[PDB]
């Protein structure tokens, strides 16, 4: 049911995702945490929805549920992402959540953005990320008790080991895209190594690429008698990483929880590990990538040309 991190501190191995979640976010928690079962909630500033989730989290937790017993995560955006802009951005971010302390807070995209960047990014709005410097400011925050654990999202290997050769205090976790179709065995591995635990964000291809009605995964649901979502979930936790799946729907939230107790069998979950790795739902492209003057002409530069 959960994950250990090297602090010992643990996440459990089921989130609720909050991006797109609209009008719909506090609902959508509360009924997650309060009917459904789950004790961990993923958003971030750059959703636009961490109010909601303040107020959904604190109707959850007006019977009596603990804060000690919930995890909830959020993230730093690139625009904050130099190291006197942590602690007003985290104060922000506190204050919407209506929280005291984070479980775990996640640098967004180890890229800085400039203020009023643009989609594509113009001439000179990706910024130089002074990441060591960025990492010791968040290591502060867990010196405080602000935050219980750091870690970081979207990384590559590259990336990975210049962050592990200046941490005093390891990322507990590295949060990426992972989903049959894009597994990165390349960044599993490289976490393992290092001892970093593996949220699979998109863990079901996202709105964009949803993988509900994969023929394959149908076929697999049909077999198990579960559904295509509960597949996808069971797949990632038999992989090792936590999930967190996004819905604002009350029965799929409460569906898909329920990847406890049973599993998929191996060749099924073989044939799932052998759908094809096509592209990434999300590439970065729209953030970091400017094709006339770069300075990330293509988003495989975003990749370190790991992808
Ligand atoms: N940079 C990052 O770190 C990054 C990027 C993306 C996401 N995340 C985090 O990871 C979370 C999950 O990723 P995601 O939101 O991209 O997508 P996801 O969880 O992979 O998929 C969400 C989509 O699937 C639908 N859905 C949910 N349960 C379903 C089920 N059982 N059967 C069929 N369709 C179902 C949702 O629709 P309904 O809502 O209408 O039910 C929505 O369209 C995010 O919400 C966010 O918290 C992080």
Redesign the pocket.
Known sequence: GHFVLKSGHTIPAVGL????AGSDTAHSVRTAIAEAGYRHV??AAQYGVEKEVGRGLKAAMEGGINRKDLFVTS?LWCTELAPDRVRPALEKTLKDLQLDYLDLYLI??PFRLKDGAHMPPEAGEVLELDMEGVWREMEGLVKDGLVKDIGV??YTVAKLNRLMRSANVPPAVC?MEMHPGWKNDRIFEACKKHGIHVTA???????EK?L?HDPLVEKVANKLDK???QVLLRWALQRGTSV??????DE?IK??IQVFGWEIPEEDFRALCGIKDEKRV?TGEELFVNKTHGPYKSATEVWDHED
């Open positions: 995702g909050t991006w797109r993923d958003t993230k967004h995209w999202c979207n949060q964000y998109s863990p079901l291809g996202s709105s949803n509900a559904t295509p979502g967190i799946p996004k819905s604002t729907r799929r569906e898909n999300l």
